[PDB]
Amino acid sequence: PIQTVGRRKEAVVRVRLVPGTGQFNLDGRTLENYFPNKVHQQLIKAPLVTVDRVDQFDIYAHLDGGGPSGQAGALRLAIARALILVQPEDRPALKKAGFLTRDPRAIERKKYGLKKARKAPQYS
């Protein structure tokens, strides 16, 4: 089958596609119950809704690492890769929409002399 990675901010996702009616499940739970949030709802479905496939595919998914905004954003890139393995007609749409980029955003190291990463202490 189609099995696809996705990562964000150290939040390691799995995805797998089967064709069927419009739902998807997250370790034996609904989308609405895992993310009670309107912002994270559209952001997962963005590669589905932009291309207008939407109700074609199931997703079963496993969720490790990170947090709610990390794992929600990680599903987007997981799906964005996965819809190309259906057919590479979607790739030129999905690239210009801007979903195939993972974030090279990651948390910077806390440095000696400084309390958070960049932030120095008080002076003189």
Partner: protein
Amino acid sequence: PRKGPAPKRPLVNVYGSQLVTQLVNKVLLEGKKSLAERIVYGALEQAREKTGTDPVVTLKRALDNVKPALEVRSRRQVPVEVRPDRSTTLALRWLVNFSRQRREKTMVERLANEILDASNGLGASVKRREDTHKMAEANRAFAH
């Protein structure tokens, strides 16, 4: 900033309006979006129900009555033509600050009532744009 302009941040639009996501961030403190957003959805959909009877344009028409076209600066006071996008930053940011100043119990209600006063033009947010235009256009001499 000395060497050249850095690139501006991209900004994602349930409503699908540029202004509401810009309002979310101006409301936001402590870096938590959800309590910032639920106060916006509290105030915006209160103004939907009671008075104005559409969601977005009640804010957008009120936002025109905050927006200044002109601002004052000191060279060391020279008035300056404000950019199209900088006018919207002052529009949101004033509207949020006077909601924090207001006496009403909760910011669902304070931010709601501020938008209604901005629709009329009796509010403290709309009071400020007159004062900036007063201080701008009373000068003019210094502009060269």
